[PDB]
Design a protein around this ligand. Structure first.
Ligand SMILES: [Mg+2]
Ligand SMILES: [Mg+2]
Ligand SMILES: [Mg+2]
Ligand SMILES: [Mg+2]
Ligand SMILES: [Mg+2]
Ligand SMILES: [Mg+2]
Ligand SMILES: [Mg+2]
Ligand SMILES: [Mg+2]
Ligand SMILES: [Mg+2]
Ligand SMILES: [Mg+2]
Ligand SMILES: [Mg+2]
Ligand SMILES: [Mg+2]
Ligand SMILES: [Mg+2]
Ligand SMILES: [Mg+2]
Ligand SMILES: [Mg+2]
Ligand SMILES: [Mg+2]
Ligand SMILES: [Mg+2]
Ligand SMILES: [Mg+2]
Ligand SMILES: [Mg+2]
Ligand SMILES: [Mg+2]
Ligand SMILES: [Mg+2]
Ligand SMILES: [Mg+2]
Ligand SMILES: [Mg+2]
Ligand SMILES: [Mg+2]
Ligand SMILES: [Mg+2]
Ligand SMILES: [Mg+2]
Ligand SMILES: [Mg+2]
Ligand SMILES: [Mg+2]
Ligand SMILES: [Mg+2]
Ligand SMILES: [Mg+2]
Ligand SMILES: [Mg+2]
Ligand SMILES: [Mg+2]
Ligand SMILES: [Mg+2]
Ligand SMILES: [Mg+2]
Ligand SMILES: [Mg+2]
Ligand SMILES: [Mg+2]
Ligand SMILES: [Mg+2]
Ligand SMILES: [Mg+2]
Ligand SMILES: [Mg+2]
Ligand SMILES: [Mg+2]
Lengths: 155, 119, 73
RNA sequence: AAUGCGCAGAUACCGGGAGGAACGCCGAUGGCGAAGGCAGCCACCUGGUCCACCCGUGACGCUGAGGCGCGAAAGCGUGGGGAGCAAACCGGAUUAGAUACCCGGGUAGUCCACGCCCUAAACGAUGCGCGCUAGGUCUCUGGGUCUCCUGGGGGCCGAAGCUAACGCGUUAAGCGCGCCGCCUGGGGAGUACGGCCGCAAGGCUGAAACUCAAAGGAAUUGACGGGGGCCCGCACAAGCGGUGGAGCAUGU
C-alpha cells in the first residue's frame, strides 16, 4: 500500500446474531475456504456455551474478544545499530484483528477433540479472563511497558 | 531525619545520563539518584525514561525528609532533561520554580577533539 | 514574523559612553546578562560598537552583569 | 561496550583557595594591516589611512635585479611555565587483520622570554602604479544644501568589452603606457651534483641519463554515489499459504 490508504472491506453481517464481528471470527476459523464447515463450528460452540452458562452466547463472545484485545505492543525498528522493540498503542482495527486471530490460535491448542468444543471452552475461558488466548495478550502488553526505555521512538 | 520541608532539585543532564540531586535551602544535598542508581546499566541511563525514574526516585527519597516544595535547577542539554523536570512536577513535590544554569565558558580551555569538530 | 519591540524606541535620550547609567544600560541586556543583538537594540553599526565597549566597562565595575540565570521552562 | 575512576566515599551539590590558558554575548550581514596576521577591559608608547580647507614646495615621480627587514603552523637551542589539549607512546574496543577510524590514559608540544628556522592551498592559486571605459543594489567610514548628492573601503547583479569555457566586468580577467617576477609537454625531480645558508631538521638555487603520447583546463551527454528532493512496483511492512526436513515424481 504505497499509493492508497487502504480501505477496510466491510463484511456481510451475521446470519443469526447479525453481528459483523461474528462473521469476522468465522473467517478466521475458516480454512481452505470451507465457510460452511466454519460457521457450522462457531454456532456449534454457541450451543456449548448456552448449557455451560445461563447467559446467552453472544454476551460471552463479545466479552471474550474484548478481554483478548491488546492495548499496547512492540514493533521492531532499527534506530542506529541493532533492532529495537518500540512500544506503542495498537489501533482499534488491529486490536480486533489480533484478538480474533489469537482466539482461534489458542483455541486449536486446547486438547479437546471436537473443534466446536475448543472454540467454546476457549471463548468462555476468555470472558472469564483465563485461557491461553488472554495470555498472549498479557504477554504482548507485558512486552511493551517493559521497554518504556524506548517508547520515545513513537514511529 | 531533619524535616527540611523546602529545598533544591538539581538536574544534571547529559547525553549519557541524568543525575538528580535534592539539596537543602542552601546547597547541601539531602539525597540523590541517577540512571544507574535505578538499575539502568548500559546506555539506557541516557534515555528519557531513566531520567523520569531517576527524578521520581530522587523525590521519593526526599519526601522522607518531609519535603513539600523545591526550586529546580537544570544544567546540561542531554535527553531526559525535560522528563526530569516533568517527573518532579508529578511527584507531589511542589516545583517552586525552574531555572536553567548550564555552565558555559567565555572561551577558555581547548575542548576535546570530539567537542571541537567544525570548531 | 519575529516582531518584537525595539530597545531604542522605548528610550528617549542617552549618552552611549556613560558606563555608569545602569538604569539605562540594563535595558540593553537579555533575561541573561548577554549584550543584545542589533535587531533588538535598534542601534547602528557605530553606536552598537560603543555600547558594547561601555557595557563591558560597567561590568568590570560590577554595575552590570556578565551572565544571569534563565528563569522559566 | 570495555579499559578507567569510586566505600582511603568518587559522580552530582554548596563554600573557599591555587594555577594556567583562552577571551562568551556584542560579532557581521563587519573592521585594521604590505603580507603573515590582528578581537575581554584600562593606561602608555607607536605605525598606516581617509575626509574637508584647497594654504605651502614645485615633477621632488613610477617600478625595482642585488641588499636589508618582516614572515602562519610545525620544528630547533637556552631558560621558565604547564589548566585544558595532545604527535609519540600505554591500554580498551572494532575488524579477516586494524601498527586507524571510536573509548580511557599520556610525553614532546601547545604558553612566556631570548636566540634560530623561512616553509605553506604564504589563495583572490589574480606583482606594483597610473590613465580611460553604463548603470543597479546592500554595506563600513567621512564631508555636504542630509529625498537623493560627494570621497574612501567592503560585497553583490550587470553596459561595452574580454574569455577555451567557467567566468571577469570602476575592488577588470576590459581598453592602454611603465617597471619587476615567472612559464616553454609528462614522468625521472624540487631528485643528484655544486654553491650559499642553518645547531639541526632542513632551506634557497637546481640539472642530466633514461622514458612516455600524453600529462592537462573548461564545458557536454551519460552512468554512478554508503549525495540531496519527489514518486512508484506483493519491493518491504501487514497478512494467509508454502519451499527448506520426509517419501516419491520430474529437471539439473
Ligand atoms: Mg565502608
Ligand atoms: Mg568532579
Ligand atoms: Mg567548589
Ligand atoms: Mg600548578
Ligand atoms: Mg587591503
Ligand atoms: Mg587570512
Ligand atoms: Mg594613528
Ligand atoms: Mg595653493
Ligand atoms: Mg611658486
Ligand atoms: Mg618600491
Ligand atoms: Mg629608481
Ligand atoms: Mg615563522
Ligand atoms: Mg611554534
Ligand atoms: Mg621550546
Ligand atoms: Mg621546556
Ligand atoms: Mg615542571
Ligand atoms: Mg585526553
Ligand atoms: Mg585519545
Ligand atoms: Mg619565539
Ligand atoms: Mg605561489
Ligand atoms: Mg552623512
Ligand atoms: Mg565602491
Ligand atoms: Mg571585507
Ligand atoms: Mg555582454
Ligand atoms: Mg561567453
Ligand atoms: Mg559580474
Ligand atoms: Mg585597470
Ligand atoms: Mg588571463
Ligand atoms: Mg622558477
Ligand atoms: Mg622537468
Ligand atoms: Mg622541499
Ligand atoms: Mg645540493
Ligand atoms: Mg654548515
Ligand atoms: Mg623529455
Ligand atoms: Mg575537467
Ligand atoms: Mg498487484
Ligand atoms: Mg512480508
Ligand atoms: Mg508467516
Ligand atoms: Mg524437500
Ligand atoms: Mg542443479
Amino acid at each position: 500500500a504505497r499509493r492508497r490508504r487502504a480501505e477496510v472491506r466491510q463484511l456481510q453481517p451475521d446470519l443469526v446474531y447479525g453481528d459483523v464481528l461474528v462473521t469476522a471470527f468465522i473467517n478466521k476459523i475458516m480454512r481452505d475456504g470451507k465457510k460452511n464447515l466454519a460457521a457450522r463450528i462457531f454456532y456449534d460452540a454457541c450451543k456449548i456455551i448456552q448449557e455451560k452458562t445461563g447467559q446467552e452466547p453472544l454476551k460471552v463472545f463479545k466479552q471474550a474478544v474484548e478481554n483478548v484485545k491488546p492495548r499496547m505492543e512492540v514493533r521492531s525498528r532499527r534506530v542506529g545499530g541493532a533492532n529495537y522493540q518500540v512500544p506503542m498503542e495498537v489501533s482499534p482495527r488491529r486490536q480486533q484483528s489480533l484478538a480474533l486471530r489469537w482466539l482461534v490460535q489458542a483455541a486449536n491448542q486446547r486438547p479437546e477433540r471436537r473443534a466446536a468444543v475448543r472454540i467454546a471452552h476457549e471463548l468462555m475461558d476468555a470472558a472469564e479472563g483465563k485461557g491461553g488466548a488472554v495470555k498472549k495478550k498479557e504477554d504482548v502488553e507485558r512486552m511493551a511497558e517493559a521497554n518504556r526505555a524506548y517508547a520515545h521512538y513513537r514511529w | 531525619k531533619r524535616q527540611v520541608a523546602s529545598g533544591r532539585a538539581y538536574i544534571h543532564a547529559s547525553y549519557n545520563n541524568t543525575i538528580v540531586t535534592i539539596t537543602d535551602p542552601d546547597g547541601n544535598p539531602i539525597t540523590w539518584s541517577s540512571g544507574g542508581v535505578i538499575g539502568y546499566k548500559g546506555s539506557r541511563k541516557g534515555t528519557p525514561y531513566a531520567a523520569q525514574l531517576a527524578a521520581l526516585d530522587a523525590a521519593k527519597k526526599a519526601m522522607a525528609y518531609g519535603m513539600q516544595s523545591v526550586d529546580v535547577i537544570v544544567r546540561g542539554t542531554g535527553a531526559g532533561r525535560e522528563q526530569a523536570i516533568r517527573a518532579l512536577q508529578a511527584s507531589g513535590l511542589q516545583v517552586k520554580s525552574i531555572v536553567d544554569d548550564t555552565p558555559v565558558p567565555h572561551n577558555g580551555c581547548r575542548p576535546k577533539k570530539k567537542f571541537r569538530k567544525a570548531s | 514574523p519575529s516582531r518584537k519591540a525595539k530597545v531604542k524606541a522605548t528610550l528617549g535620550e542617552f549618552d552611549l559612553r556613560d558606563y555608569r547609567n545602569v538604569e539605562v544600560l540594563k535595558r540593553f541586556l537579555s533575561e541573561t546578562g548577554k549584550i543584545l543583538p542589533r535587531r533588538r537594540t535598534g542601534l547602528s553599526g557605530k553606536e552598537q560598537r560603543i555600547l558594547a565597549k561601555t557595557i563591558k566597562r560597567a561590568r568590570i565595575l560590577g554595575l552590570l552583569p556578565f551572565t544571569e540565570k534563565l528563569v522559566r521552562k
